Design an enzyme around this catalytic site. Structure first.
Site, short mmCIF file in Angstrom:
data_model
loop_
_atom_site.label_atom_id
_atom_site.label_comp_id
_atom_site.label_asym_id
_atom_site.label_seq_id
_atom_site.Cartn_x
_atom_site.Cartn_y
_atom_site.Cartn_z
N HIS A 92 0.07 3.91 -0.28
CA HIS A 92 0.19 2.48 -0.02
C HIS A 92 -0.31 1.75 -1.25
O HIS A 92 -0.74 2.38 -2.21
CB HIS A 92 -0.67 2.07 1.17
CG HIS A 92 -2.11 2.47 1.04
ND1 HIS A 92 -2.54 3.76 1.25
CD2 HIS A 92 -3.20 1.77 0.65
CE1 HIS A 92 -3.83 3.84 0.99
NE2 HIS A 92 -4.26 2.64 0.62
N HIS A 94 -2.43 -2.00 -2.90
CA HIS A 94 -3.36 -3.11 -2.75
C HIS A 94 -2.95 -4.03 -3.89
O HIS A 94 -2.86 -3.59 -5.04
CB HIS A 94 -4.80 -2.64 -2.93
CG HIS A 94 -5.29 -1.75 -1.83
ND1 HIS A 94 -5.75 -2.24 -0.63
CD2 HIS A 94 -5.38 -0.41 -1.75
CE1 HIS A 94 -6.11 -1.24 0.15
NE2 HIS A 94 -5.89 -0.11 -0.51
N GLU A 104 -8.33 -2.60 -6.45
CA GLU A 104 -9.61 -2.48 -5.76
C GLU A 104 -10.63 -1.98 -6.76
O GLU A 104 -11.69 -2.58 -6.92
CB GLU A 104 -9.47 -1.53 -4.58
CG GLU A 104 -8.44 -2.02 -3.58
CD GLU A 104 -8.70 -1.48 -2.20
OE1 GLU A 104 -8.65 -0.25 -2.02
OE2 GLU A 104 -8.97 -2.29 -1.30
N1 LIG Z 1 -5.43 9.11 13.60
S1 LIG Z 1 -6.41 10.24 13.07
O1 LIG Z 1 -7.39 10.51 14.07
O2 LIG Z 1 -5.63 11.31 12.53
O3 LIG Z 1 -7.20 9.62 11.85
C1 LIG Z 1 -7.84 8.33 12.04
C2 LIG Z 1 -8.29 7.91 10.71
C3 LIG Z 1 -8.58 6.44 10.62
C4 LIG Z 1 -8.63 5.93 9.20
C5 LIG Z 1 -7.32 6.01 8.48
C6 LIG Z 1 -7.42 5.66 7.05
C7 LIG Z 1 -6.15 5.89 6.29
C8 LIG Z 1 -6.21 5.47 4.85
C9 LIG Z 1 -6.38 3.99 4.67
C10 LIG Z 1 -6.41 3.55 3.25
O4 LIG Z 1 -7.59 4.15 2.63
S2 LIG Z 1 -7.75 3.95 1.09
N2 LIG Z 1 -7.40 2.44 0.79
O5 LIG Z 1 -6.78 4.78 0.49
O6 LIG Z 1 -9.13 4.16 0.80
ZN LIG Z 2 -5.92 1.97 -0.30
#
Ligand SMILES: NS(=O)(=O)OCCCCCCCCCCOS(N)(=O)=O
Ligand SMILES: [Zn+2]
Ligand SMILES: [Cl-]
Length: 258
Positions: A92, A94, A104
């Protein structure tokens, strides 16, 4: 009252629902190029995206995700500061309301127009879910974007944004090759950090490439046409969806280059 990037639910508010926000290894951080130390112990970085399989793109109301099929060992990241194999699950961006901001992470306080995040989970943990419960469950490859020449490999993402303007919308997005988003050099800075969005889990080994990729003004402009809101709601342009630099605290940023 869901978290966001506005005045009342922005980064300065996240700590309330996610106290880890003021934790010891939060991301992003400013990268002081002079204090970062070359680390001889780093194995060369290996990015193998040749067999990567994108599935669909989604507007989650915060940014847009290009999701990959991580059921098999296809797109993987290894070597470098990493131990074992990490699998690409999604990427993704930012970005800002203006070219002067959006990234970031920052380099000597400089903010790039945007930042690309390729998210991978440690295969020793089975799936993404179990991995975000580990201090080394994740590895994110961050790539800076600056406005200049167009990035050919990004145009497919750009032309598809029209179909996922509002929060919740998704569109199938197969055969997208992320290798077209990589700069020439794999030089990078690495340190132990976290997710930059809630739940802000501290399970990330960050690998930030020194060389930014350049995209055209027109390409970044389209990113800005996306919406935070859902269809049939007041328009809130999706811009400045980035968390500012957090305290480095008890950490050292290592460089893969001398
Ligand atoms: N659905 S599951 O149980 O398999 O997992 C949940 C995880 C929740 C958090 C998901 C975060 C996914 C990454 C978001 C962006 O992060 S970055 N900008 O790259 O630091
Ligand atoms: Zn990110
Ligand atoms: Cl707003």
């Amino acid at each position: 009252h869901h978290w966001g990037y506005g005045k009342h639910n922005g980064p300065e508010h996240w700590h309330k629902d996610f106290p880890i926000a003021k934790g010891e290894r939060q991301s992003p951080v400013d990268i002081d190029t002079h204090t970062a130390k070359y680390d001889p112990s780093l194995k060369p970085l290996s990015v193998s995206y040749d067999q990567a399989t994108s599935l669909r793109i989604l507007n989650n109301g915060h940014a847009f995700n290009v999701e990959f099929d991580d059921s098999q060992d296809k797109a993987v990241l290894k070597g470098g500061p990493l131990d074992g194999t990490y699998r690409l699950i999604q990427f993704h961006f930012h970005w800002g309301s203006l070219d002067g901001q959006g990234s970031e992470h920052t380099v000597d306080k400089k903010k790039y127009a945007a930042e690309l995040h390729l998210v991978h989970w440690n295969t020793k943990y089975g799936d993404f879910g179990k991995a975000v419960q580990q201090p080394d469950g994740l590895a994110v490859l961050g790539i800076f974007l600056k406005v200049g020449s167009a990035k050919p490999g990004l145009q497919k993402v750009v032309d598809v944004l029209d179909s996922i303007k509002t929060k919740g919308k998704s569109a199938d997005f197969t055969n997208f090759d992320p290798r077209g988003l990589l700069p020439e050099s794999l030089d990078y800075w690495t340190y132990p950090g976290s997710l930059t969005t809630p739940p802000l889990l501290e399970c990330v080994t960050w690998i930030v490439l020194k060389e930014p990729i350049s995209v055209s003004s027109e390409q970044v402009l389209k990113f800005r046409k996306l919406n935070f809101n859902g269809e049939g709601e007041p328009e809130e342009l999706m811009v400045d969806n980035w968390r500012p630099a957090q305290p480095l605290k008890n950490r050292q940023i290592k460089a893969s280059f001398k």
